[PDB]
Each structure stands twice: as structure tokens, then as C-alpha cells.
Amino acid sequence: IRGDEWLATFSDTITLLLTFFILLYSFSS
């Protein structure tokens, strides 16, 4: 392997954390 190939699914789950934070953002409280 190249030692980097999870950076695809890493970006996936980071995007998903971002989505959860969006979910924390429709009300901000």
C-alpha cells in the first residue's frame, strides 16, 4: 500500500463530522 489510501474514507468521515456539526447548526442551541 502507499500509507495514504484511507485519506479517501478519512475525508468521508471528516465530511460526516461536518454534517453532524451542520446538524448542531440549525438552532445553534
Partner 1 sequence: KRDILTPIGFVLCFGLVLWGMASGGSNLKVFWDVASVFITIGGSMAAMLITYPMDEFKRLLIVIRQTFKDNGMSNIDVIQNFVDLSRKARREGLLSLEDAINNLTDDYMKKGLRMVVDGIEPETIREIMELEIDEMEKRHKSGADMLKTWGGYAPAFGMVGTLIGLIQMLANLTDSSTIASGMGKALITTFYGSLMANAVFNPMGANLMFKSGVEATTREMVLEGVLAIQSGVNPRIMEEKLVSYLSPPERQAYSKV
Residues making contact with partner 1 (CB under 8 A): 1-13, 15-20, 22-29
- DSSP-derived letter for residue 12 is H
From residue 18, give the alpha-carbon distance in Å to each of 3, 8, 12, 14. 24, 15, 10, 6
**x/- binding map, residues 1-29, to a copy of itself, per CB under 8 A?**
---x--xx-xx--xx-xx--xx-xx--xx
DSSP string for 14-28: HHHHHHHHHHTTSS-
Q: How far is the CB of 16 from a copy of itself (least distance, A)?
A: 10
Residue 6 near which of a copy of itself, partner 1, none (CB within 5-8 Å, type-dependent): partner 1
